[PDB]
Amino acid sequence: HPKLVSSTPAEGSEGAAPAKIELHFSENLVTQFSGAKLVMTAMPGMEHSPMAVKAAVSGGGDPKTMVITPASPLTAGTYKVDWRAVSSDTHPITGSVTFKVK
Amino acid sequence: HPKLVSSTPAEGSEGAAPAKIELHFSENLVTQFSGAKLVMTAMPGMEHSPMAVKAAVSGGGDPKTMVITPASPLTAGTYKVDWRAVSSDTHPITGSVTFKVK
Ligand SMILES: [Cu+2]
Ligand SMILES: [Cu+2]
Ligand SMILES: [Cu+2]
Ligand SMILES: [Cu+2]
């Protein structure tokens, strides 16, 4: 049962639009099974049903890191990254990271 | 050189969020080569760099129709569908349809 140790953007961060989103876990991820979806849950001034933003997901420089690369620049608003992490123990762990763009 | 004959949502339409976007061409499309990308170009009150929205593209009930299915509900704003149509004549034709959601 791997744990999300940290991320950039960090949970609850509000700032610049990220070129890539890094999720750092407590255990080495098995890439074939670990995934993420990026959704926008609000624009400034108005919440909306989650709208899936095109993104690619891959491994980073470290086996414990999952990288989400939006296909395009993220506009101002609120986003969530819904993640699934699987290590060598085979248990699928899910969670979400929420952050805001300026 | 196939032509876009019509679409739903229609070019410049402003109304409800579409469950699917249909593009109707003058010639039968070859599915392997015909494609589309859906981007959002504005929220209400603010234009922004085009942000790619996750969508699947396939053929409709008629060989002349290309269907774009957003993965999630489209929020209010302006969208463009950047399309590539290829018929049996092999010439790749591109264009864009712009519409607004309520
Ligand atoms: Cu476990
Ligand atoms: Cu939004
Ligand atoms: Cu032609
Ligand atoms: Cu927008």
Swiss-Prot record, chains A, B:
GO terms for biological process: copper ion transport; response to copper ion. Transmembrane segments: none annotated. Induction: By copper. This is Copper resistance protein C. It comes from the Bacteria. The redox state of copper bound to CopC may act as a switch between the possible trafficking pathways of the metal ion. Monomer. It is found in: Periplasm. GO terms for molecular function: copper ion binding. The lineage of its organism: Bacteria, Pseudomonadati, Pseudomonadota, Gammaproteobacteria, Pseudomonadales. Cu(2+) binds at H1, H91. Keywords: Copper, Metal-binding, Periplasm, Plasmid, Signal. The chain holds residues 25 to 126 of 126 of the full protein. Copper-binding protein involved in copper resistance and homeostasis. Probably mediates copper resistance by sequestering the excess of copper in the periplasm. May act as a copper carrier in the oxidizing periplasmic space that exchanges either Cu(I) or Cu(II) with its putative partners CopA, CopB and CopD. One of its GO terms (cellular component) is periplasmic space. Belongs to the CopC family.
